[PDB]
Structure 1
Amino acid sequence: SLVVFPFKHEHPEVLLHNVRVAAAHPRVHEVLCIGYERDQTYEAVERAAPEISRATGTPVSVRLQERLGTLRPGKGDGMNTALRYFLEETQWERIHFYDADITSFGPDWITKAEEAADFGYGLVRHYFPRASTDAMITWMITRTGFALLWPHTELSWIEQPLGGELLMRREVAAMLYEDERVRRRSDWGIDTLYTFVTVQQGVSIYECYIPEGKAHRLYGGLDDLRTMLVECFAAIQSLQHEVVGQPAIHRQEHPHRVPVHIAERVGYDVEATLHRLMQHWTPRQVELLELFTTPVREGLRTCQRRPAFNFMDEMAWAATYHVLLEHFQPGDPDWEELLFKLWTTRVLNYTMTVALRGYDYAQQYLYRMLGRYRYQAALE
């Protein structure tokens, strides 16, 4: 069973630790390492690869990601390349996928996934405890969108639809690789496409939990997440007229208690995010806001002079999400920048009205937020 590791610019030590863990496992029959470019990180893994495939017995190869899609060359080209090598150049029946930077990795990840895949699941998906102010794309964009567009389906119930940690058996991989929509998704939008089309095609999905597991992403402003945001939203927008059957088997490993050190985590720099909400304005962005409801139009125009976000409550965000679905133009610098400020005001609003009330209150909220969105869409 193949085990793929997409990397780019990560410290090669951590990666190579995870690759050793993988090759040692008695249920892993090959390891593939798909780099972004021929940098020093990649050069390091290419020299290390002959060594690990000798001590452990299992072969380990390294390849550059190919240009398979039509958007930005990113995560999507890397994962779809792994698919091409899995189907066309080997004959294994199971492929794993793990982020390279994961310092929390262990043998318990790979075993659980293979163990669940024995019950016959086409797709096993890992999911971990996340801080109340992390995962804001997941919650306010991916899950909210799935809730508002496909409330009766399993889509919005998937815990971490942007997650790169998963297993997929051969038929499932082959189906995704042949699918024109996922093939062209060469950027951050790929995880959204794997998730959406597996559910649409009736693939049965287990979700593995991981008690404690994640590499605390970097403390900066919400700016750092800007590219991922506009691409993840575009992905959902591109799927908005698709139809999805209700039936699809879906189960999820019970979540163990969130460890303290994750519940006590802050997901972003509040000051930098407020400052950034006042930057990069343009007369067209002000013109384009006329398309939104009055409180949102008025609210965000205030951000030219001072930070504003109390306006962007749960309802305001839904109303804003519908307008974005209709009018957002991927690749348009003004539309991309407005999405980023709007989403920012939502993150700030939720942070001070919800997160600030404590990690528990944040979890109950977020599950219940999806519930009301589900209900509001089913009605209309």
Structure 2
Amino acid sequence: SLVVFPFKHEHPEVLLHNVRVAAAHPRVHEVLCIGYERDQTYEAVERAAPEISRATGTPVSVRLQERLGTLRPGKGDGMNTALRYFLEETQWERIHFYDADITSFGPDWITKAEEAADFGYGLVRHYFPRASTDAMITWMITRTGFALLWPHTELSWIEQPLGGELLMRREVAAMLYEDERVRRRSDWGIDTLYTFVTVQQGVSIYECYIPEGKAHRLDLRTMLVECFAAIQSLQHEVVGQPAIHRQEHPHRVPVHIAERVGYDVEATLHRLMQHWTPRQVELLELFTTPVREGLRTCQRRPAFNFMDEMAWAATYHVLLEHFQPGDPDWEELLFKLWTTRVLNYTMTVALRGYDYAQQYLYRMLGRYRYQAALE
């Protein structure tokens, strides 16, 4: 198997540790790191590589990403470069991707994915326990979108559709790399695209649980806009009824993960009152009253009680239809709109406890799916 670590700016020792873990694994035949630019991380890896592959017997190499897509040159280009290399320059049966920033990485992650692949599956996705104010793009943007636009499909059931830790087999990777839609997604939209098109092609999927969680490095705005844009670009797509989808049963959350805070609330409330623009005030005219009045209040004081579940779904539709990717005002507006949803969820749900928050989030997708199936 080929194991791939895409990296942009990262601590050399963190990446090197993961590289060494992967190389030492009996089922890994090659390690490839794909870099954004030729920075210090890059040179650090390039120096260590001869040594690592000499010690473990499995070859390790670095490359810059190629420009394969047509959006902002980001992780997509990184990942698709690995796909191309994997497909065109190696003979290996399977490819793994893991984020380079991971500090809780162990041989077990590779084993669990390899074993599931042996069982037949075409895509194996790792998924993790998460703090109740983490993963707000995942929940309020990706999974919400999937639920609202493809309620009868497997999409919204996938636990971590943005996750960069997965194993695909050669034919699945070929399938995706062929696909014009995924190829062009050079930015943060790439994981969304991998998730969507594998499901749309009826690839069978297993979700691995990694009980110890994904410790990593601790931009949010860019990721938010590009994820939403990814969903918007797919909105007219047609998806068949489910292929095989199974998920390893989750363990209880680790205490240290259940007990941490996703963000700085004071700073977020502040941020909500900044970067206003007469054009944004105008754009709000497109939204339902509660939302329009709600968000306008944020010029003077933080307001978010208005942005409950049903308000957010209404807002999501309007965004789907009018959001202009690349327009600074629309991006700021999406950022602010989403922020109020996060804040509302934080104060009315997250503050009720980890378990309450989980039961809520799942019920939220269910309510969205049901509503969607009504129209």
Partner of 1:294: 289
After TM superposition, give the deviation of residue 307 of structure 1 in Å: 0.5
1:273 and 1:84 mapped to 2: Cα distance? 40
After TM superposition, give the deviation of residue 216 of structure 1 in Å: 5.1
2:242 and 2:208 mapped to 1: Cα distance? 21
Residue deviations 1:243-264 (CA, integer Å, cap 9, x gap): 0001310000110110011010
CA contact (8 A) 2:102 2:216 kept: no
Residue deviations 1:294-314 (CA, integer Å, cap 9, x gap): 000000000011101000000
Match of 1:259 among 236, 254, 260: 254
SS in structure 2 of the partner of residue 265 of structure 1:
coil
Residue deviations 1:123-180 (CA, integer Å, cap 9, x gap): 0000000011010000000000000000000000000000000000000000100100
SS in structure 1 of the partner of residue 85 of structure 2:
helix
> Across the two proteins, how many residue pairs are aligned to each other?
374
SS in structure 2 of the partner of residue 117 of structure 1:
helix
1:82 and 1:15 mapped to 2: Cα distance? 17
2:345 and 2:59 mapped to 1: Cα distance? 48
2:76 and 2:2 mapped to 1: Cα distance? 18
Residue deviations 1:320-342 (CA, integer Å, cap 9, x gap): 00000000000000001000000
1:144 aligns with 2:144: yes
SS in structure 1 of the partner of residue 249 of structure 2:
coil
Q: Provide structure 2 residue ranges, at least 5 long, that are not aligned to the other structure.
A: none
Match of 2:355 among 356, 360, 363: 360
SS in structure 1 of the partner of residue 129 of structure 2:
coil
Residue deviations 1:7-53 (CA, integer Å, cap 9, x gap): 11110101111111101111111100001100111011000000000
CA contact (8 A) 1:126 1:210 kept: yes
After TM superposition, give the deviation of residue 225 of structure 1 in Å: 1.0
2:132 and 2:79 mapped to 1: Cα distance? 28
1:135 and 1:155 mapped to 2: Cα distance? 17
SS in structure 2 of the partner of residue 241 of structure 1:
coil
2:15 and 2:328 mapped to 1: Cα distance? 35
TM-score, reference length from structure 2: 0.99
1:29 and 1:213 mapped to 2: Cα distance? 26
CA contact (8 A) 2:104 2:216 kept: no
CA contact (8 A) 2:6 2:34 kept: yes
2:129 and 2:358 mapped to 1: Cα distance? 10
Residue deviations 1:272-320 (CA, integer Å, cap 9, x gap): 1001100000001011000000000000000011101000000000000
CA contact (8 A) 1:105 1:213 kept: no
CA contact (8 A) 2:131 2:261 kept: yes
CA contact (8 A) 1:188 1:231 kept: yes
Partner of 1:307: 302
CA contact (8 A) 2:101 2:216 kept: no
Partner of 2:30: 30
CA contact (8 A) 2:84 2:177 kept: yes
1:216 and 1:302 mapped to 2: Cα distance? 36
After TM superposition, give the deviation of residue 215 of structure 1 in Å: 2.1
CA contact (8 A) 1:53 1:60 kept: yes
Residue deviations 1:96-140 (CA, integer Å, cap 9, x gap): 000111100001100010000011101000000001101000000
Identical pairs, percent: 100
CA contact (8 A) 1:94 1:168 kept: yes
Partner of 2:274: 279
1:212 and 1:366 mapped to 2: Cα distance? 22
Partner of 2:326: 331
SS in structure 1 of the partner of residue 96 of structure 2:
strand
TM-score, reference length from structure 1: 0.98
- CA root-mean-square deviation: 0.7
After TM superposition, give the deviation of residue 232 of structure 1 in Å: 0.1
1:121 and 1:41 mapped to 2: Cα distance? 34
CA contact (8 A) 2:122 2:168 kept: yes
Q: Provide structure 1 residue ranges, at least 5 long, that are not aligned to the other structure.
A: 218-223
CA contact (8 A) 1:8 1:35 kept: yes
1:73 and 1:278 mapped to 2: Cα distance? 30
Deviating above 4 A after TM superposition, structure 1's stretches of 4 or more consecutive aligned residues are: none
CA contact (8 A) 1:95 1:170 kept: yes
CA contact (8 A) 2:147 2:365 kept: yes
After TM superposition, give the deviation of residue 213 of structure 1 in Å: 1.9
After TM superposition, give the deviation of residue 370 of structure 1 in Å: 0.3
After TM superposition, give the deviation of residue 185 of structure 1 in Å: 0.3
CA contact (8 A) 1:86 1:95 kept: yes
